[PDB]
Homo-oligomer: A and B are copies of this chain.
């Protein structure tokens, strides 16, 4: 069918990234951005693999925080609509990538039209190591597995509710 089950990560074209310094929560380390004619969707709960390590390949301070956040056009943050306000010092990477219960689901569902941004703001408060991306990764889904969920992509061409989803 037109629906397809996928799982995102860092090394993709439409996604973008950048290094970040300590005490600069307004600098997004990851910028997801709607492609043209490809709507996506996220139900109320889907995994994330928030790997966010140092230059020296070390997860940053546990007091670090991650905030996923929706953004409309204009490169603009938005309050009504936000997912995954959480710390860093919580995930236990090596297991949470696999187990069903160390897994981490979203707050609520989501949709992303052909041009809509999502940002991953990172509050490193202070007294910490700077962030690097090449030593870091990210995900949003587990389509391979059974118990877990995944991202639902659709091509805008094969629909008649496209205008309603555009509203």
Contacts and interface: CB of A to CB of B under 8 A. Distances in A.
Interface of A: 26, 36-37, 72-74, 76-79, 113-115, 157-158, 163, 166-167
A78 B79 CA distance: 10
A32 to B, nearest CB: 18
A37 B115 contact: yes
A94 to B, nearest CB: 32
A38 to B, nearest CB: 9
A115 B74 CA distance: 19
A113 B37 CA distance: 11
A72 B73 CA distance: 17
16 contacts: A26-B26, A36-B115, A37-B114, A37-B115, A72-B79, A73-B79, A74-B79, A76-B77, A76-B78, A76-B79, A77-B77, A113-B157, A157-B163, A157-B166, A157-B167, A158-B167
